[PDB]
Amino acid sequence: GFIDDSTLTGGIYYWQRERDRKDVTDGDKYKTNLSHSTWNANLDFQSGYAADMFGLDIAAFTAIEMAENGDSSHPNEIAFSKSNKAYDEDWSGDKSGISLYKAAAKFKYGPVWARAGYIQPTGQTLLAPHWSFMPGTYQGAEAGANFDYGDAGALSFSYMWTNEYKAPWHLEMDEFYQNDKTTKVDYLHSFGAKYDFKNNFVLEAAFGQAEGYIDQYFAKASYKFDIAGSPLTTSYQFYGTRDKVDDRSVNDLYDGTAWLQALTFGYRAADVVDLRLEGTWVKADGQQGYFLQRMTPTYASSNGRLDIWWDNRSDFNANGEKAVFFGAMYDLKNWNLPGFAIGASYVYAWDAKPATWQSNPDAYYDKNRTIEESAYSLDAVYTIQDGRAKGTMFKLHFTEYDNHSDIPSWGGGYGNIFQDERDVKFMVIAPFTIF
Numbered sequence: 001g002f003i004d005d006s007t008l009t010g011g012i013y014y015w016q017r018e019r020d021r022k023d024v025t026d027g028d029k030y031k032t033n034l035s036h037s038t039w040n041a042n043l044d045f046q047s048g049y050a051a052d053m054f055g056l057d058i059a060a061f062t063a064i065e066m067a068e069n070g071d072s073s074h075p076n077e078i079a080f081s082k083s084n085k086a087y088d089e090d091w092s093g094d095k096s097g098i099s100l101y102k103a104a105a106k107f108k109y110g111p112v113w114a115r116a117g118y119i120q121p122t123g124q125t126l127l128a129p130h131w132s133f134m135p136g137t138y139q140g141a142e143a144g145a146n147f148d149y150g151d152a153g154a155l156s157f158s159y160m161w162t163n164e165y166k167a168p169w170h171l172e173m174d175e176f177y178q179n180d181k182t183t184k185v186d187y188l189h190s191f192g193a194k195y196d197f198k199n200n201f202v203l204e205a206a207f208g209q210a211e212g213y214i215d216q217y218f219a220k221a222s223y224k225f226d227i228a229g230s231p232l233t234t235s236y237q238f239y240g241t242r243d244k245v246d247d248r249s250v251n252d253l254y255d256g257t258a259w260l261q262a263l264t265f266g267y268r269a270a271d272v273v274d275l276r277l278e279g280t281w282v283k284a285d286g287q288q289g290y291f292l293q294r295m296t297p298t299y300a301s302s303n304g305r306l307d308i309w310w311d312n313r314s315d316f317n318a319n320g321e322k323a324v325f326f327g328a329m330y331d332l333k334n335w336n337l338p339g340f341a342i343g344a345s346y347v348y349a350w351d352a353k354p355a356t357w358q359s360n361p362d363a364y365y366d367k368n369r370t371i372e373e374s375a376y377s378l379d380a381v382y383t384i385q386d387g388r389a390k391g392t393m394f395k396l397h398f399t400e401y402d403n404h405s406d407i408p409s410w411g412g413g414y415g416n417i418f419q420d421e422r423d424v425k426f427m428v429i430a431p432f433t434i435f
């Protein structure tokens with residue numbers, strides 16, 4: 001029933017960050033890169049289905065700046081950028097505001113479903129929003145279907161079409177453009193599918209396009225099996241992208257197909273420590289020099305599905321780059337501290353190459369150089385177990401990041417690699433239900 005199955009939920013969020021980065025042009029001074037305290041709050045209405053076919057979802061969030069040092073850079077991605085539209089971004093500030101982030105009619109008819117309006121991708125395609133506390137928002141529609149074949153498996157597939165987007169730090173939607181920020185991309189769309197064989201084997205794949213510009217690929221195979229009574233989870237993931245501009249203009253991003261391949265292992269040992277072993281390998285020949293899982297190249301302009309996230313500041317996505325991640329998350333419940341967990345992680349990556357050509361090379365550009373990067377992070381988490389504030393979570397994250405070069409940040413033909421950093425994030429997440 002439309003009314004009786006309605007839910008209204010939300011949260012209060014607090015984020016405080018101090019990040020400094022090495023300026024190898026000013027004597028390696030670790031300068032303030034981010035320093036701010038910011039609140040978010042959201043309210044999210046989800047209706048039931050009238051006649052099990054017709055529903056509505058509406059949700060909004062606010063960001064309130066609390067503190068920000070004058071030397072912190074922008075946008076910090078928790079407040080709103082001072083620039084309301086992504087393609088106007090000029091990196092000059094941040095501001096408070098209110099954004100409508102869901103506003104959609106939803107539909108169901110047998111095995112088919114659809115949503116249209118201000119939406120997040122929700123099916124099997126490779127479109128994705130950015131996530132801060134809240135998600136970004138697409139203007140468009142998605143429709144898909146679910147077919148259950150009992151023990152023989154289950155098939156799901158969906159299609160999404162969109163012509164505008166806003167990241168959670170943009171108050172307004174913008175259209176899509178090529179790398180020059182002026183040649184129009186009329187839409188993004190994507191089709192994908194998932195087959196679950198109900199034996200812990202699962203296959204997923206999707207294709208997407210940016211109109212006139214980019215073809216995007218995704219595939220993933222996952223498998224779980226028990227060792228010592230606990231599942232070892234494994235997956236192989238492939239992400240691919242090809243452009244349609246190979247004239248060596250500013251819009252020519254990739255030579256051939258660029259891709260990112262990954263293998264992941266996960267295992268919970270002694271029922272108390274979550275372990276992660278992951279590796280990635282990137283090919284990205286051409287002018288850009290790094291792999292992007294999104295189909296529009298401009299920062300904040302759209303996003304795409306990428307199931308690999310190591311929270312170690314760098315993306316480890318340069319041409320040629322190989323990288324290995326080890327993480328451990330230790331639940332302290334047997335010290336009688338249920339809800340307390342501490343963790344640590346480490347990344348080492350090598351063979352990172354630059355763009356294979358540059359139009360205005362800088363002093364440090366050398367087509368055949370290779371470099372290395374590494375990082376380690378520490379994590380502490382507490383979730384309130386009982387009472388008024390049950391589920392309220394406190395998190396503390398520290399990262400030390402090391403560029404194994406003295407190439408200045410964003411330079412040398414490594415357009416997505418920056419210099420040594422120290423990063424500390426403290427966040428509080430306080431969900432609530434009104435009904």
Ligand SMILES: CC(=O)N[C@@H]1[C@@H](O)[C@H](O[C@@H]2O[C@H](CO)[C@@H](O[C@@H]3O[C@H](CO)[C@@H](O[C@@H]4O[C@H](CO)[C@@H](O[C@@H]5O[C@H](CO)[C@@H](O)[C@H](O)[C@H]5NC(C)=O)[C@H](O)[C@H]4NC(C)=O)[C@H](O)[C@H]3NC(C)=O)[C@H](O)[C@H]2NC(C)=O)[C@@H](CO)O[C@H]1O
Nearest residue numbers: 073074075076077091131132133134298299300309315416
């Ligand atoms: C609530 C919660 O817990 N949320 C997490 C969420 O944090 C996770 O998402 C991750 O969020 C962080 C944000 O904190 C993301 O970090 C982004 O990552 C970007 C790349 O992935 C990185 O992009 C670079 O940003 C630069 C500006 O800051 C760009 O520089 C500009 O380049 C222009 C190019 O010419 C130039 O003209 C400008 O002059 C230059 N800027 C200047 C001069 O100031 C640069 O181009 C850009 N690179 C790319 C490839 O776009 C961001 O800097 C970085 N920002 C931060 C941290 O502030 C991280 O990427 C997110 N995760 C991903 C990618 O997976 C989320 C993940 O699932 O989990 C949630 O739970």
Ligand SMILES: [Mg+2]
Nearest residue numbers: 298299300301
């Ligand atoms: Mg972006």
Ligand SMILES: [Mg+2]
Nearest residue numbers: 402403404420
């Ligand atoms: Mg260094």
